[PDB]
Amino acid sequence: SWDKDVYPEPPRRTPAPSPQTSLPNPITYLTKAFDLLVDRPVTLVREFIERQHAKNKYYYYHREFRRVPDITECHEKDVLCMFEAEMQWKRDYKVDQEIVNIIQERLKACQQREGESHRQNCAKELQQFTQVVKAYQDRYHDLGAHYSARKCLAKQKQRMLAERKATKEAA
Amino acid sequence: AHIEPRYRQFPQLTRSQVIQAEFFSATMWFWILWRFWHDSDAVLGHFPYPDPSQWTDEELGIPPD
Amino acid sequence: AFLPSAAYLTHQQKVLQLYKRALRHLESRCVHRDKYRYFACLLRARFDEHKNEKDMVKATQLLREAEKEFWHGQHPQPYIFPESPGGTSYERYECYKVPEWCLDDWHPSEKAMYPDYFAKREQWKKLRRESWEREVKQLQEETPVGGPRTEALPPARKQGDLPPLWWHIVTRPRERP
Amino acid sequence: ITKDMLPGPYPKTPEERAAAAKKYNMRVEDYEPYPDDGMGYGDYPKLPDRSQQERDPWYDWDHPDLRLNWGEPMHWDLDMYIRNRVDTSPTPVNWNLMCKHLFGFVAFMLFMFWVGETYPTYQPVGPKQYPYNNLYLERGGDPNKEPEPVVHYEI
Amino acid sequence: DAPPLTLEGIKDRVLYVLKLYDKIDPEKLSVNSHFMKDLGLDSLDQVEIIMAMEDEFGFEIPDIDAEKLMCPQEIVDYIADKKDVYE
Amino acid sequence: SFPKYEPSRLASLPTTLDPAEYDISSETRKAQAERLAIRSRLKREYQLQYNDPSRRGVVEDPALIRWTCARSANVYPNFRPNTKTSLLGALFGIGPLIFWYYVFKTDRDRKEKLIQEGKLDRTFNISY
Amino acid sequence: MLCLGAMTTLFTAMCALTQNDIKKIIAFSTSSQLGLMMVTIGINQPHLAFLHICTHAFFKAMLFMCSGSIIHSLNDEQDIRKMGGLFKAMPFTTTALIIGSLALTGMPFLTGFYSKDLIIESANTSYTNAWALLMTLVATSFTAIYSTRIIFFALLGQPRFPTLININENNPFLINSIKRLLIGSLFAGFIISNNIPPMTIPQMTMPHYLKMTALTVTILGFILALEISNTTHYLKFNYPSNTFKFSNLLGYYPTIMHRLTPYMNLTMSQKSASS
Amino acid sequence: RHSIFAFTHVLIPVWIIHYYLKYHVTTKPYTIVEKKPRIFPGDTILETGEVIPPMKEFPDQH
Amino acid sequence: GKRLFIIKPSGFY
Amino acid sequence: SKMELPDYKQWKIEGTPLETVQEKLAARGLRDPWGRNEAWRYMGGFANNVSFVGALLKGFKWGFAAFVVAVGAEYYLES
Amino acid sequence: GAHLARRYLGDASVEPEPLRMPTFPPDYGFPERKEREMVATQQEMNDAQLVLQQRDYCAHYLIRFLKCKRDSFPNFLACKHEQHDWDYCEHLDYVKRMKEFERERRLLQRKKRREQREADMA
Amino acid sequence: MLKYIIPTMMLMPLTWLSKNSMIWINTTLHSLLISLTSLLLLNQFGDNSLNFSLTFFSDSLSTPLLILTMWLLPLMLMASQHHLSKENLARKKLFISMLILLQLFLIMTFTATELIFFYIMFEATLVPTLIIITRWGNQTERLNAGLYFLFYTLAGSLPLLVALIYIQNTMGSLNFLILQYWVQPMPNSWSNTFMWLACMMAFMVKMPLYGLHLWLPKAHVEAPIAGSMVLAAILLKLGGYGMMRITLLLNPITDFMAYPFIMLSLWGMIMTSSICLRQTDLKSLIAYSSVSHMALVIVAILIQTPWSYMGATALMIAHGLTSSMLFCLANSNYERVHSRTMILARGLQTLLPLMAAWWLLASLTNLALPPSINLIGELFVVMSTFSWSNITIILMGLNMVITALYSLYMLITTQRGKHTHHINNILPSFTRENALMSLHMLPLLLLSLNPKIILGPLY
Ligand SMILES: CCCCCCCCCCCCCCCCCC(=O)OC[C@H](COP(=O)([O-])OC[C@H](O)COP(=O)([O-])OC[C@H](COC(=O)CCCCCCCCCCCCCCCCC)OC(=O)CCCCCCCCCCCCCCCCC)OC(=O)CCCCCCCCCCCCCCCCC
Ligand SMILES: CCCCCCCCCCCCCCCCCC(=O)OC[C@H](COP(=O)(O)OCCN)OC(=O)CCCCCCCCCCCCCCCCC
Ligand SMILES: *C(=O)CCCCCCCCCCCCC
């Protein structure tokens, strides 16, 4: 399974079976037939495979990239440090892409899970999506196919000069 | 025995095709008249449609001025 | 205008072709058999009225404005026979009409599926290869100087010889392969 | 194939036209080349601009599906005029009358749809009446704020 | 579908159509009864005979081959060639 | 009386409406006979090669080879630069390039002006 | 969507009225029904349009299968002017073709009722393009016209097919294949429309002329086409009009635009592009 | 080998697809997302037991 | 009975 | 093998609409030669075909009878 | 379809226009007019996942009918009663909309008679 | 990269020291082993390019082109071993050596760290292709085919030589890895304008650009089969590879200098597709289709968005496989009818059903049928150009219409209809020909299952 914090779910609330009519539904018998024919032997094969997994347990790891100096504190035309800064920025750009993808998955899962009441009961996910898309658009949009941490720093400096002029024209 | 072709005349019929044809045409007319006997409001009308001219003025809030 | 045997349609041929096209487009206009048969004998009497017109110019004139009458009174979608050109089943089975020479390129493990058939195909091709040079020398002893005149082929005149240029007419594929 | 059976330059003398018409296997008087105006035809014949659907289909053609003979000169758009493509067959109705009828019918239908959009049909009712101030919290309204009250009464 | 044709069947049906045509009496008709010289028919009547053959056997005979069939044996042989009977 | 048929490029005249079909003049007889002689010569020359048992290959058609060599190889050696082809080549060769240049340039100037002034709805656009 | 669907269901059902090949007529039938589906999408009724897809499947597949059984029993005869006299000759095909035609026209309480009747009842009672609704009703009449055209020239009357009868339909593959769609075209409209959950609010309150409208214009189309059918047996030879040449030559749009537009993309591609 | 069709084409693919969806698809987040079931006044939540209270009494019309 | 030989290309290869 | 044909003599057009056609052709001095060929379509088991209103009402008798029986059945069942 | 011809082919000032109406106050002419009771609670029809076109003043019959249709599976005809209740309450809501239309039509007729009496008197 | 250069050079003693009947088998076997080994270049990273040495590197753009190049050599050996079966043994080994030497120049054209070594290899690839076309070509005009091949590819590449040395003197290096970090913005001036033209027109010839494309429907037509395969599969793609390396240095002058070339490619993809609708020559139809598909790659490089470069590299790999298969199909029918006229032999499904299935698959991949990587490249380039300007969707969709039209017209004309009566040498499909078709199509179909390896450096 996965982490329930990063992929949140509301508590499951199913209603109880309240039959009214005299006719038996086919779906209880189909569910019990599917159980006794499929849900038990698949589980037994998974138990055997799980025992074979437990006979030799071994581990893989998540790689940790420590934070090197970024492009703002690298010298101009110094490839040894700005190579490290560029690799750091490219890994951060790919992780930002995956953050935006996670928030998209939250939004779409909320829309289907809420069904018809999705316009009301998914305002939180829509707010989070609008925030992360506005951040990603201010951070990486229009950098082009030859994007770099220099291009992103130049875009950030132009946007910061625009915000500084917009603040200075309001005081 | 399969059907043998005839010449310039009415072809040989099986009993089975004629009784199935009459059976399904009778089932069609049964189903149409049966659902006309039960529902009768999907064809003709579900409720009476009121006439807006026949309505009074007091239920519509009309002060006579 | 465009024929295999001759180069032109005669006047009598154009009269008969207009008669046939007029009856077919009439039957397209006149779907039911009895009503067609009524108007078809009316149209047949309209043709047979000027059957004996001795002036060739007057006959050509009546044929020409009869073509005009027909072009005004034709059916927009005439009934085409299905295997006739323009029909619904025309050239439908041509994808099954594999030519005869493809049998020669079979592997011998599938030529052994039909021993009598290819044992007969060998003597058919034998008959063709001993008829070919004799029918070619038949063609060059009868063709006039300057080439042939019409596209009509001469028959075999002797005994023992086969008609010239016969292989792709005798060994053509069937209409239902 | 040899050099004097290939397409060559535009003939200007009658004997060059005769050698060209003998090359393309047709009569000299029926041999009409394209007009020499730089369109790149050379001495190539101008076949009378028909499709292959008009050809006599009961003839024993050399090429049946093309309705074409062996050695007969081909039109410059022979691949265009096949029966898998553009048909130039004669129609029962004239071309101009077909264009008039089709354009008039399409333009009249479009005009009448626009006029019916200008004069729509409806029913003798008011708008549909929705609770909770026209379903404000259901249409995605923000719950920190509060809209105007849309109050519906009996009638 | 589509039962096979024979020369006997085509011959029977062509003579059957030509015995239902009022301008031919049924005793003078034979397999080699030429329509113009023997039976006293017209060219137009022979055209209607070809059209009756077309309506009988469900295919068009072209006019260049319609205008050369002048006896019922040639009509039977032509339908035999166009339908490939005795396969 | 009857509507006369109007022959166009995409609907030619039928043979049953052509006035020059019914000419019994002897020049038409000689022309049809000479065309029949040429067609019969080519037909016999085809089916002599076509019915040959010794042939296993392609009956080559010089009209087809000549057609392809006309459609490909004989375009530049019989081109002459004159007024008609020059106005057609400038009218149709550089014409649409200039037209789409002005269209796409106007569209991109308008869109860049709307973006650098902050008006174009670009909220969720992060894939480009 | 409303204007385009109304234009489609007008033009195709009007072109269907004088075609002669039966498969062409059923193709114009299914294109007119798709135009009706486009109409009922355009009036914000998507679930009625999808219910009409699920309804239309049964009887239009059954009508093509009955036409195929007729074509196979007449040796690739696909033209309705060489048909007829097939009421007792092909009784199961006659039965299923009549049931499919009645489901197409909107017979009460067959499969086509539960979709098409509610489509017209929702197309009347909405803020709608009025000309689109009027052309929809004209198309509703035209469906009955070509349905009885198919029944008349295909089944009624006396034979017109050639003399060798090869009429045979007694194979359980053909019988069961038309039979299960026949059971579908009888019952599946009721079954599906009473199994589907309500997704819109249906307009069930409307005046009497506006409730009976689809049925009335359908029966009037039946009556007018019965007049058209009875005026065929007469011994009158009418010269063709321009309406007949419009509806018989496909509306002239598969004639001009299949000659004019393929002329330009094939000649400009050489005389202005290649050469 | 009498109902080998319903074994080999159904009951083995149901096993394969059920093992797949059960231990490789639903073990991944948001892959099979289900619309939550429809709660009415009068139901009972099978996870809690709280009976959803019924509606207000109707201003009866007939 | 009266079965007919069907000419088809070489399906061996 | 052999397919037998019915006799050619039986297709007389007396009793067909071809009789009416030959009467209206004899009204103007004409004689129809192609009646007996088309006589079989208007004779035998193809003669007297139904009209359209009877073609719709195929099975209406048995269907209405089963309708009455089943309505009486659900009328006697409910008590 | 007579009011269509009364708005299009006659005068348009007296017929109530469909797009922007009611143009009169709801208290104009009514002594002590009462609101419409909303029977279905907002969280109730939020939980039953009703379509936003179906969240009108008569959604409680639709909730009971959907609950019947779920609780009577597979018998898909056992809830004709609640379906008729929902359809008749939709009929009554359509009647209320017709009454709003006729109210606006008679008040525009009142405005026409008012301005004609004023144009005759003053 | 030396572990692929050295086996490619050992293919020369492998082909010159073989037995006279073993020279196709050995070269096919060991080139298949080198292509098996070529998948070890897939060690790519999301941040860093696989930087081997000072001379060679391989990012995610050059890697699918290297796998395609090392895979194309066994397919050319299979394709050419029938028409050269009556060739002299020494000339046969010389042909195989020209193919191997061309592979050797290509696989260090794509891995050239430094751009003048890219230029030297990029112009060294001409001379084996020159020898193949103008030695083992077919008809009379093969010498005019290579003459306009050698003139156009050198007259475009000549200002590129001065332009790269001008970058060398100004920046200090032509290492692509150094110029990733030392690139300066190129402003608006006339000197920088002709700088941009000198850096771009060479690859514009090699793509080809519309208007500069006239070498291609003669160089592909007059070539033998291995020459046409390598020309349509790799040698056109050298231009896209060089553009994707060189537009790093040409910013932001590209953003207003690319407009006339975007117009040329967006209109030439309509023009050359219309030209494909009226080709009598099948190999010419495949050639003009190659021009029409590379026009989209030119547009996607010149608008320089990430989706555009992903679609352009996907479209280059997909079109290489598809056009190589189509030329091999055209050769499979040319080996039977001895003419490239498309209208000559028709109805070939009635005689060759399995080869007609391969024709159908190659035609469906030609018209970008989803979920092929043909459609992935086509679709991503259409997405990026719609983002570039919304009006370009008309030209894109109209091109896709004409593309499906000429693809299925080629299918109908070559495979369907009535067959030709006077052609009787139509052999059954050999095992070699179907092996060639399957080794084209099966990698192309498998790349739809895992398309991320052919989506370039910015996937
Ligand atoms: C990594 C492991 C992967 C394992 C799975 C494999 C994945 C797919 C690989 C390719 C599979 C097909 C390859 C063979 C077909 C081509 C040749 C052919 O037709 O031979 C006929 C022949 C049988 O026919 P026949 O009767 O003898 O002769 C035919 C006649 O001549 C008359 O010929 P015909 O016209 O009747 O027949 C041609 C017909 C023609 O059919 C058509 O034209 C219709 C196809 C188009 C429409 C339908 C599909 C549309 C797309 C949707 C489906 C894909 C996505 C589905 C997912 C959900 C939705 C997203 O084609 C077919 O029948 C082939 C069916 C499969 C078609 C796949 C799509 C092709 C369309 C073009 C590209 C589309 C985009 C790419 C899709 C890629 C999918 C992976 O087939 C064989 O003998 C097959 C041999 C074994 C093939 C092995 C394939 C694997 C090779 C890879 C080796 C390495 C990995 C190990 C895997 C081992 C697996 C065993
Ligand atoms: C929601 C809004 C809806 C708006 C709808 C109205 C606007 C669009 C109007 C339609 C425009 C396209 C239609 C016109 C071209 C039709 C071409 C065609 O299919 O021709 C058919 C023709 C064969 O027809 P036929 O002769 O009947 O065949 C008898 C069988 N032997 O076949 C041939 O002759 C073969 C020719 C092959 C090559 C044809 C090349 C034509 C390519 C046309 C591309 C059009 C691109 C449009 C792009 C629009 C972008 C916005
Ligand atoms: C006034 O007539 C309002 C009703 C809706 C608009 C008119 C609809 C007319 C067509 C339907 C009725 C047809 C009766 C034969």
mmCIF file of N, CA and C in Angstrom, chain D residues 118-133 135 137-139 150-155, chain K residues 3-4 7-8 18 21 33-36 38 40-42 52 55-57 93-94 96-101:
data_model
loop_
_atom_site.group_PDB
_atom_site.id
_atom_site.type_symbol
_atom_site.label_atom_id
_atom_site.label_comp_id
_atom_site.label_asym_id
_atom_site.label_seq_id
_atom_site.Cartn_x
_atom_site.Cartn_y
_atom_site.Cartn_z
ATOM 1 N N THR D 118 -33.651 33.810 -33.998
ATOM 2 C CA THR D 118 -34.060 35.155 -33.612
ATOM 3 C C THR D 118 -35.471 35.159 -33.023
ATOM 4 N N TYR D 119 -36.346 34.263 -33.489
ATOM 5 C CA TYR D 119 -37.702 34.106 -32.962
ATOM 6 C C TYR D 119 -37.856 32.691 -32.415
ATOM 7 N N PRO D 120 -37.401 32.432 -31.192
ATOM 8 C CA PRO D 120 -37.462 31.071 -30.652
ATOM 9 C C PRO D 120 -38.863 30.684 -30.207
ATOM 10 N N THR D 121 -39.006 29.409 -29.869
ATOM 11 C CA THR D 121 -40.205 28.929 -29.202
ATOM 12 C C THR D 121 -39.923 28.685 -27.724
ATOM 13 N N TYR D 122 -40.973 28.791 -26.916
ATOM 14 C CA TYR D 122 -40.868 28.589 -25.480
ATOM 15 C C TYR D 122 -42.220 28.115 -24.964
ATOM 16 N N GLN D 123 -42.330 28.023 -23.642
ATOM 17 C CA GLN D 123 -43.521 27.549 -22.963
ATOM 18 C C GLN D 123 -44.048 28.613 -22.007
ATOM 19 N N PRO D 124 -45.372 28.637 -21.721
ATOM 20 C CA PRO D 124 -45.895 29.726 -20.865
ATOM 21 C C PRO D 124 -45.595 29.508 -19.385
ATOM 22 N N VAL D 125 -44.307 29.562 -19.040
ATOM 23 C CA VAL D 125 -43.837 29.389 -17.672
ATOM 24 C C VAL D 125 -42.768 30.422 -17.369
ATOM 25 N N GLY D 126 -42.523 30.612 -16.078
ATOM 26 C CA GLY D 126 -41.381 31.362 -15.629
ATOM 27 C C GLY D 126 -40.149 30.485 -15.590
ATOM 28 N N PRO D 127 -39.050 30.999 -15.047
ATOM 29 C CA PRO D 127 -37.855 30.167 -14.898
ATOM 30 C C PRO D 127 -38.049 29.144 -13.792
ATOM 31 N N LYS D 128 -37.207 28.115 -13.821
ATOM 32 C CA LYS D 128 -37.238 27.105 -12.775
ATOM 33 C C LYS D 128 -36.723 27.707 -11.473
ATOM 34 N N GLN D 129 -37.348 27.327 -10.365
ATOM 35 C CA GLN D 129 -37.101 27.951 -9.076
ATOM 36 C C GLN D 129 -36.277 27.012 -8.208
ATOM 37 N N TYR D 130 -35.142 27.503 -7.716
ATOM 38 C CA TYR D 130 -34.166 26.676 -7.029
ATOM 39 C C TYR D 130 -33.937 27.166 -5.605
ATOM 40 N N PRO D 131 -33.931 26.280 -4.620
ATOM 41 C CA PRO D 131 -33.774 26.690 -3.222
ATOM 42 C C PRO D 131 -32.328 27.034 -2.888
ATOM 43 N N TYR D 132 -32.129 27.402 -1.616
ATOM 44 C CA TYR D 132 -30.824 27.708 -1.021
ATOM 45 C C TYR D 132 -30.106 28.817 -1.787
ATOM 46 N N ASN D 133 -30.888 29.831 -2.176
ATOM 47 C CA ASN D 133 -30.459 31.008 -2.935
ATOM 48 C C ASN D 133 -29.835 30.607 -4.273
ATOM 49 N N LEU D 135 -29.164 27.678 -5.381
ATOM 50 C CA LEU D 135 -28.161 26.635 -5.132
ATOM 51 C C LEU D 135 -26.740 27.203 -5.109
ATOM 52 N N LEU D 137 -24.304 27.212 -2.657
ATOM 53 C CA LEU D 137 -23.254 26.317 -2.196
ATOM 54 C C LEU D 137 -23.107 25.095 -3.090
ATOM 55 N N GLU D 138 -24.105 24.801 -3.927
ATOM 56 C CA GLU D 138 -24.007 23.675 -4.848
ATOM 57 C C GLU D 138 -23.317 24.059 -6.151
ATOM 58 N N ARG D 139 -23.504 25.293 -6.622
ATOM 59 C CA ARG D 139 -22.838 25.765 -7.834
ATOM 60 C C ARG D 139 -21.391 26.192 -7.606
ATOM 61 N N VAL D 150 -32.042 34.763 -2.367
ATOM 62 C CA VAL D 150 -32.978 34.545 -3.464
ATOM 63 C C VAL D 150 -34.164 33.801 -2.863
ATOM 64 N N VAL D 151 -35.221 34.538 -2.533
ATOM 65 C CA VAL D 151 -36.371 33.999 -1.818
ATOM 66 C C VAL D 151 -37.491 33.727 -2.813
ATOM 67 N N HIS D 152 -37.975 32.488 -2.836
ATOM 68 C CA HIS D 152 -39.091 32.093 -3.681
ATOM 69 C C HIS D 152 -40.340 31.923 -2.830
ATOM 70 N N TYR D 153 -41.449 32.479 -3.302
ATOM 71 C CA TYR D 153 -42.714 32.444 -2.586
ATOM 72 C C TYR D 153 -43.705 31.528 -3.296
ATOM 73 N N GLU D 154 -44.829 31.290 -2.628
ATOM 74 C CA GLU D 154 -45.908 30.499 -3.200
ATOM 75 C C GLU D 154 -46.692 31.305 -4.228
ATOM 76 N N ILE D 155 -47.295 30.596 -5.175
ATOM 77 C CA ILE D 155 -48.240 31.200 -6.103
ATOM 78 C C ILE D 155 -49.255 30.155 -6.548
ATOM 79 N N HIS K 3 -49.568 32.326 -27.313
ATOM 80 C CA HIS K 3 -48.798 33.418 -26.725
ATOM 81 C C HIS K 3 -47.497 33.672 -27.469
ATOM 82 N N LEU K 4 -46.989 32.672 -28.196
ATOM 83 C CA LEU K 4 -45.908 32.904 -29.149
ATOM 84 C C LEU K 4 -46.329 33.916 -30.208
ATOM 85 N N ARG K 7 -46.746 37.400 -28.590
ATOM 86 C CA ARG K 7 -45.512 38.146 -28.374
ATOM 87 C C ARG K 7 -44.826 38.521 -29.683
ATOM 88 N N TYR K 8 -44.978 37.711 -30.730
ATOM 89 C CA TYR K 8 -44.231 37.976 -31.954
ATOM 90 C C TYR K 8 -45.010 38.827 -32.950
ATOM 91 N N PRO K 18 -39.712 35.862 -21.770
ATOM 92 C CA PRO K 18 -39.261 34.698 -20.993
ATOM 93 C C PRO K 18 -37.925 34.896 -20.304
ATOM 94 N N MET K 21 -37.658 37.813 -16.212
ATOM 95 C CA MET K 21 -38.939 37.904 -15.523
ATOM 96 C C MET K 21 -38.841 37.046 -14.272
ATOM 97 N N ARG K 33 -48.032 37.081 1.540
ATOM 98 C CA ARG K 33 -47.617 35.937 0.741
ATOM 99 C C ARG K 33 -46.525 35.169 1.478
ATOM 100 N N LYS K 34 -46.572 33.845 1.387
ATOM 101 C CA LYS K 34 -45.677 32.992 2.153
ATOM 102 C C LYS K 34 -44.618 32.351 1.264
ATOM 103 N N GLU K 35 -43.507 31.972 1.893
ATOM 104 C CA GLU K 35 -42.390 31.355 1.197
ATOM 105 C C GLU K 35 -42.723 29.918 0.803
ATOM 106 N N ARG K 36 -41.791 29.293 0.090
ATOM 107 C CA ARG K 36 -41.909 27.884 -0.248
ATOM 108 C C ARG K 36 -41.069 27.061 0.716
ATOM 109 N N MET K 38 -38.837 24.196 1.966
ATOM 110 C CA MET K 38 -37.863 23.277 1.397
ATOM 111 C C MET K 38 -37.810 22.043 2.287
ATOM 112 N N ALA K 40 -36.506 18.847 1.641
ATOM 113 C CA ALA K 40 -35.230 18.150 1.661
ATOM 114 C C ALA K 40 -34.148 19.060 2.224
ATOM 115 N N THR K 41 -33.453 18.572 3.246
ATOM 116 C CA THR K 41 -32.335 19.294 3.828
ATOM 117 C C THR K 41 -31.179 19.311 2.827
ATOM 118 N N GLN K 42 -30.347 20.354 2.916
ATOM 119 C CA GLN K 42 -29.263 20.564 1.960
ATOM 120 C C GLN K 42 -28.228 19.445 2.026
ATOM 121 N N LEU K 52 -27.770 18.808 -10.233
ATOM 122 C CA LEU K 52 -28.069 20.184 -9.851
ATOM 123 C C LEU K 52 -29.309 20.733 -10.549
ATOM 124 N N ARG K 55 -32.104 19.482 -8.034
ATOM 125 C CA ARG K 55 -32.124 19.968 -6.654
ATOM 126 C C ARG K 55 -33.075 21.147 -6.499
ATOM 127 N N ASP K 56 -34.323 20.943 -6.902
ATOM 128 C CA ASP K 56 -35.358 21.961 -6.837
ATOM 129 C C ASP K 56 -36.147 21.822 -5.535
ATOM 130 N N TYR K 57 -37.286 22.522 -5.438
ATOM 131 C CA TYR K 57 -38.167 22.486 -4.259
ATOM 132 C C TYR K 57 -38.979 21.195 -4.134
ATOM 133 N N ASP K 93 -45.229 21.828 -9.551
ATOM 134 C CA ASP K 93 -44.208 22.867 -9.683
ATOM 135 C C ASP K 93 -44.291 23.549 -11.050
ATOM 136 N N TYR K 94 -44.621 22.782 -12.094
ATOM 137 C CA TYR K 94 -44.833 23.371 -13.413
ATOM 138 C C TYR K 94 -46.072 24.260 -13.425
ATOM 139 N N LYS K 96 -47.053 25.971 -10.812
ATOM 140 C CA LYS K 96 -46.603 27.195 -10.147
ATOM 141 C C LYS K 96 -45.832 28.100 -11.104
ATOM 142 N N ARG K 97 -45.040 27.504 -12.000
ATOM 143 C CA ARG K 97 -44.352 28.300 -13.018
ATOM 144 C C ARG K 97 -45.338 28.923 -14.010
ATOM 145 N N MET K 98 -46.376 28.168 -14.393
ATOM 146 C CA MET K 98 -47.444 28.709 -15.233
ATOM 147 C C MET K 98 -48.178 29.851 -14.541
ATOM 148 N N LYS K 99 -48.363 29.744 -13.224
ATOM 149 C CA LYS K 99 -49.021 30.803 -12.467
ATOM 150 C C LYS K 99 -48.157 32.050 -12.398
ATOM 151 N N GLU K 100 -46.835 31.876 -12.292
ATOM 152 C CA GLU K 100 -45.924 33.019 -12.375
ATOM 153 C C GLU K 100 -46.004 33.696 -13.741
ATOM 154 N N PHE K 101 -46.082 32.897 -14.811
ATOM 155 C CA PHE K 101 -46.217 33.443 -16.163
ATOM 156 C C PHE K 101 -47.519 34.221 -16.320
#
